[PDB]
Amino acid sequence: ELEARRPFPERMGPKGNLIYKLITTTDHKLIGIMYCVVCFAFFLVGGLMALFMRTELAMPGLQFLSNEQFNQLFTMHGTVMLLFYATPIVFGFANLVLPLQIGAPDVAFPRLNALSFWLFLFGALIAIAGFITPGGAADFGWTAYSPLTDAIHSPGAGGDLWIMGLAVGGLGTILGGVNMITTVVCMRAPGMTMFRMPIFTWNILVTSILVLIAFPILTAALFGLAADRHLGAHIYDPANGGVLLWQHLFWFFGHPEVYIIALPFFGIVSEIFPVFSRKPIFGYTTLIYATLAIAALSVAVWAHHMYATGAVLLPFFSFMTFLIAVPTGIKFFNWIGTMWKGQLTFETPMLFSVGFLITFLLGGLSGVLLASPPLDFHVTDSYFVIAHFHYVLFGTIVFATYAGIYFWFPKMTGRLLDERLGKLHFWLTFIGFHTTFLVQHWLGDEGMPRRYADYLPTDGFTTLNVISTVGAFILGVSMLPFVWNVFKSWRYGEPVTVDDPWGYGNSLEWATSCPPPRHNFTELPRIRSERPAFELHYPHMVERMRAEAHVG
Amino acid sequence: MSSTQDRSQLDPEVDVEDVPSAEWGWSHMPIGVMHIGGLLSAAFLLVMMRGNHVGHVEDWFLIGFAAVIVALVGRNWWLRRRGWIR
Amino acid sequence: LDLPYGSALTSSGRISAVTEPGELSVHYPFPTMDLVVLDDALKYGSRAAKARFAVYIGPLGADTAATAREILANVPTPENAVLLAVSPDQRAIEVVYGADVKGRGIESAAPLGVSAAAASFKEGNLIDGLISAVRVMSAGVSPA
Amino acid sequence: WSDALALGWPTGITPEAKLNRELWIGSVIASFAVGAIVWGLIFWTSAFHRKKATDTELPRQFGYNMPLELTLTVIPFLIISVLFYFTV
Amino acid sequence: MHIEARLFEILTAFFALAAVVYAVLTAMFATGGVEWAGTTALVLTTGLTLITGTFFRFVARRLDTRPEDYEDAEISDGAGELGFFAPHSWWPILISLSFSTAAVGAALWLPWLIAAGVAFVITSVCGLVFEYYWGPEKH
Amino acid sequence: STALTHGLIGGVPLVLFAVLALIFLTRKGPHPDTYKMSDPWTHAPILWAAEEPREVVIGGGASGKW
Amino acid sequence: CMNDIIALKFHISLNATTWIGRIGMVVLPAIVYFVAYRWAISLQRSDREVLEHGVETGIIKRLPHGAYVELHQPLGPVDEHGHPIPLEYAGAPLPKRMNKLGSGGAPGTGSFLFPDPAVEHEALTEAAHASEHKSLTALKEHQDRIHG
Amino acid sequence: NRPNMVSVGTIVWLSSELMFFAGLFAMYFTARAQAGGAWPPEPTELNLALAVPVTLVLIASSFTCQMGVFAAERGDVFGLRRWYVITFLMGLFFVLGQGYEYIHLVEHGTTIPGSAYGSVFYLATGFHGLHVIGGLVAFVLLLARTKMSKFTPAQATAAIVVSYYWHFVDIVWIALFATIYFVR
Ligand code: HEA
Ligand code: HEA
Ligand SMILES: CCCCCCCCCCCCCCCC(=O)O[C@H](COC(=O)CCCCCCC[C@@H](C)CCCCCCCCC)COP(=O)(O)O[C@H]1[C@H](O)[C@H](O)[C@@H](O)[C@@H](O)[C@@H]1O
Ligand SMILES: CCCCCCCCCCCCCC(=O)O[C@H](COC(=O)CCCCCCCCCCC)COP(=O)(O)O
Ligand SMILES: [Ca+2]
Ligand SMILES: [Cu+2]
Ligand SMILES: [Mg+2]
């Protein structure tokens, strides 16, 4: 019964089978693989700017930069990292496993699914191409307060390209959001009821719903601003009450935006915990309600970004902001209960997902303090807030993203990433991050304001800047082993020839091959619970799963 | 067949595993033309630094591009020699 | 029949196997790069001679190493194929080919194809001998 | 001792500043407590609950606990309520 | 499809409550007026969910239980005929390029570029929509 | 000092590296060690064959000894 | 040649355009060569997929055991198992959409706003179909007589 | 026995397009608050004798659209093809009437850079007017496709979704008219 097999799998394709299949494709699996490659390419560009502005922040004198360059530099870092890396990388993970998770062969509209990626890429390019101009790119922050973006102040051409690129990106985002709702609602397998799908799918569905509300109101505001800058349209005049109109319009978008790039990465950790813990996810019904409550609450909390303005109803936005901190603790406790009383092995996915917990807790703790107007009266618009949103944001889209990559690399490629090369990366990242961002709280507390190009020698805060710069260079060098690992192990990696290399996988993507076929499936199991693949592989556990499920 | 398509039969007057239609036209450029071309292009990029310009940003751009070209050529040559590619 | 822990027969007749988190699936006793070197040699040799090449490493020795004739009946298209069987437990070298490579130079190829393997088998080298034998054999079989 | 707990705020020069400093220092303690009692929980299970040498069967497959989930949504609610009161 | 419909009206109820609360609480004891910017957004956020909820309710009451909506259904119940999906197309990238051209035209205020972009967009959309409907050539 | 800062920024990263690279990259992986011919062959039978050309009666043979 | 007009209308340095062109005139051709070569080979490989499997109709089947397949339309004779017999390349274009093969009739004989009597439509459809048969048959007969 | 996914796709998209107009409504209500007396300033004067008939034509367009949809469900390709042409003509009438009102208003001193009221008026009514032209393009694009192949259920689905879009358009206009010409 000997079977003939090759000594080693094929490394690469036969001199051209990708170039034409890159421009005509409608495969969701292919589009996802070409959705992160570009995201990680933009990550480096966004981070190089941070390295520049961190190097020109360690000594009191202006050594090699100017004011204008520094302004453009932090503005473009801020925009590229948020809108050209994170918001997109959300949708990369969607059309990579969601059809596999629901048991569908395809997305609802494939030929529309293709358009979103190209809109993303070209919008991003138009926005970034502001550096070719003799003037430079946008130099007014990602927030874009008015009147500073009026024809009078910031009359350059970089700002115009910024405005007109964000709109083209936002159209792709909306069109991508339209597709996932349809796919979830009307593409499911028989027996896959709404309350039987995994957590990731719920998160993506609610995220899409949130996108549909957040983005159009931003595009409208951008059109309004372009009207002022090109026609002299008297929309955001200070005399006309437009200084606060624009801020309301922007912050109706801004905070739902930061909750667009949070829940999907909650889903990833919620999918990773049960696999490596050899135990079911503790609380399935309640996590859905937590997601729904967090999403619903994050619409009526938008003026907590506007405290120093002294022009908002303070009680309204403080109480609700306190309330949006309740279900997050529920999620934390559910994760802890999931990883409670089970065999844990701590491979790379679990290590990253645990780093996520440790970082995000302090991020959220700092975030709650900002919600009280008395404390934000002293803290706002200083490096304390920068310390805050570089923990709550660095856990979801860095640690959880890497966890997802290490988790789903074999399922998408058929190779295993190295282990001795994936732990050095994690430890470098962790040490570098805590070295560079911990002292920013103190900096903001002593009275160092944000968006300052330089400072005076007799200011007190000099050594903390040196520590931050050292940590930032460690965090910048940390990424070499990861890229090396991906480059090396894509074609010379260890071959996985099973249906699941992680053993106790629960979702339906582990009930197929590595990688899956063109239409994702050659068979389907019988859908009974939220762990179909586990019951496929372990039929002797059904009686032990439905009897031990409840603790009293 | 109930289809409209008409099959064509034709007879006019590197192997087929790499280039499927290898016997229908010119489908091989010898290696060594491309390596020497790359090196010569790098030399030209390097030599254009002699002129009347007074800036130095352009010089660094030229150096970077030449370095990239040389690195690509070197990598290809090394891998071809060592036996990992054909 | 027999299914390991984590394996299950599906509705299509295909199996779904499982491996432990920190474990592999293939676990050959040879380095990866050596496997690559053997594989591409086996691939380009086979393509040139238009005859499938195979390698066997296992206990074929029962009756003067004559079950190789039965192992050759497992490769795809057994008629147009060549085999090389090696027994390290018994120091046995065997070559057997199907009835389509006749008259293409394989008659004059096996005698030195086995010598090439044996020459390197006089050292502690095993994976080197297979590639050497394949290289010396595939360069003497005419495509027709 | 208050220096290492105010994370480097300046001391006030007006009564309102002193009252704000009092509120802030009182809140930092209330946030380190809930951080410690969760870091401890994460550390506890990451050092004791592991795959031991003795390869036993899969552990207890429990996934629901209604009383603990019900008594857990109420405990932070009181904390945020008191914080809201003091904030006001 | 009752779960889908219920998930939307839950959000509708919450959004309506939030909008009504916000509108009144700003009319009384809040400087200025009603804070028209925030009130406007929340009364249309509710409408967003209301439209979808109503549509889903109608669809759910029209059609009966599907294989997806049945707790204990078999795989063999779903066997049949899915529908149509596009295997491949190179038109999306052309649409994106056309829109990019129009956007670059609008950014630098070059009306000729804007006009060219609009023409390109129309042509590309025409190409996309008519792809699987063109008949054979008449000769 | 303009001497300590420049040396420290570019010095610490390269020292933290190559100390974390000595305690991770200097251990044995899951790839099994190479088989020597001085020991009995203990492994399942191996049958390798090419996939070219793509898509019973046997009339030859040879032998050797080592 | 028009680097002074591009530098005015589009906001870019006039000094920068010269260097862009100077560096480009040695770099861009090489990139174009590589991309063109790969693209041509990929278009070749696109033709070998349809001669072997057939035209993808864009329809998914969902078999009883829960398998997803796509229906293919063979361009020639079929095997006893239903898989098409492979065809040879003859340097000629191949169809890739089912609508170009006649998977779609005329909406109906008539004006843009009013239809014609049914009999006319039936007769015209019959004539057109028969004419298509005759043309194809003539070409096939000529091609068969040539290669004897 | 299944939901129409091309129908659900259009409805979900139409929900998001309603939040686009939220911005414009917010701008209008914000600029209205800082009126400083009479909200329509001295130079401007709205003429109800031209905005009413055009609104009535736009309202009547929906009836013809629905008649076309009803004809589409039966298989009448000519019935579908007949109502959509008159719908297109009425939409074109709407656009030309709106343009005429614009020309009249500009000559009397109400412009975009002239005032804040001009700004909000033109922005709100010009973003709406773009959608109507898009709808007309959709009509012509769909009517061209009904001649390419035989009339199948997919064609009916396309007609229905286009009708959905048109209905949304005129419902938005009714709101705009009520909030601009009456609630001044
Ligand atoms: C996902 C979101 C995200 C991520 C990941 C980061 C990542 C980092 N950020 Fe953050 N940042 C923001 C979101 C993010 N940031 C936002 C929203 C602002 C607001 C500012 C504003 O108002 O505009 C901000 C602003 C901000 C500031 C405040 C600046 C100021 O206000 O003056 C600082 C301070 O140091 C900072 C530092 C960093 C550092 C050191 C990293 C490190 O993570 C990154 C280091 C990584 C790299 C450097 C990659 C390495 C690159 C290479 C090794 C070379 C490769 C070369 C090529 C490809 C050509 N960023
Ligand atoms: C990116 C992701 C992200 C996430 C998830 C959040 C989450 C939160 N954010 Fe936001 N925020 C940003 C991104 C994010 N934020 C960004 C980018 C900015 C700056 C934009 C700019 O101005 O440039 C910002 C700014 C910002 C401000 C304005 C600050 C200022 O400008 O001065 C405020 C104020 O209310 C705020 C509050 C919160 C709160 C209360 C949460 C809550 O979601 C977090 C709650 C988490 C926890 C509570 C921890 C877990 C809970 C438990 C373990 C139970 C414990 C119970 C109690 C303590 C009672 N953040
Ligand atoms: C046709 C495509 C060709 C493809 C080939 C690509 C090759 C690109 C090579 C890169 C060119 C580098 C140009 C450098 C040569 C140079 O001189 O550049 C300087 C300023 O560097 C810059 O900006 C660098 C700009 C980089 C441009 C990158 C080009 C990529 C674009 C062109 C690709 C997009 C293609 C178009 C897309 C359209 C189709 C879409 C697909 C200007 O000097 P200057 O201005 O005098 O600076 C003075 C100080 O010195 C002094 O202190 C003082 O401060 C002042 O006196 C100051 O003036
Ligand atoms: C992505 C593609 C976007 C392209 C948009 C094209 C729109 C450009 C139209 C230019 C209008 C100039 C009219 C003007 O200033 O004349 C003024 C009067 O304009 C009007 O009242 C008619 C304007 C038509 C309404 C259209 C609104 C659309 C809003 C678009 C916001 C960007 C006269 O200015 P003046 O007093 O002479 O200084
Ligand atoms: Ca400095
Ligand atoms: Cu906020
Ligand atoms: Mg501020």
Numbering used by the authors:
A (entry chain R): 10 to 561
B (entry chain P): 1 to 13, 28 to 100
C (entry chain V): 14 to 157
D (entry chain Q): 27 to 114
E (entry chain T): 1 to 139
F (entry chain U): 2 to 56, 69 to 79
G (entry chain N): 391 to 538
H (entry chain S): 20 to 203
Sentences from the study reporting this entry:
To experimentally validate our findings, we performed cryo-EM experiments, where we refined a glyco-diosgenin (GDN) detergent-solubilised, symmetric SC to an overall resolution of 2.3 Å, and a local resolution of 2.0 Å for the core parts, and another dataset of the same state, to 2.8 Å global resolution (to 2.5 Å at the core), enabling us to independently determine the position of functionally central and previously unresolved water molecules that are key for the proton transfer reactions. The refined structures revealed a symmetric SC, comprising 22 main subunits, including LpqE. We focus here on the higher resolution dataset, which contains more details, while the other dataset shows overall similar results and serves as an independent validation of our model. The data allowed us to assign densities of 614 water molecules (in the 2.3 Å map, and 249 in the 2.8 Å map), many of which are located around key functional regions in Complexes III and IV. The two datasets are consistent with each other, resolving water molecules at the same positions in several sites, but with significantly higher statistical certainty in the 2.3 Å resolution map. Importantly, the higher (2.3 Å) resolution map allowed us to further assign functionally central water molecules near CuB, as well as in the D- and K-channels. These experimentally determined water positions are in excellent overall agreement with the hydration dynamics independently predicted by our MD simulations, supporting the complementarity between the approaches, but not observed in the 2.8 Å map due to possible averaging effects. In our cryo-EM data, we observe densities for menaquinone only in the Qo1b and Qo2 sites, consistent with previous studies, although their functional roles for catalysis have remained unclear. On the Complex III side of the SC, we observe ten menaquinone molecules (five per monomer) at five different positions.
Here we resolve the functional dynamics of the 0.7 MDa III2IV2 obligate supercomplex from Mycobacterium smegmatis, a close relative of M. tuberculosis, the causative agent of tuberculosis. M. smegmatis lacks genes for a soluble cytochrome c and employs instead the QcrC subunit to shuttle electrons between Complexes III and IV, thus making the SC assembly necessary for its proper function. The SC also features a C-type superoxide dismutase (SodC) and subunit LpqE, both of which are anchored to the membrane by lipid modifications.
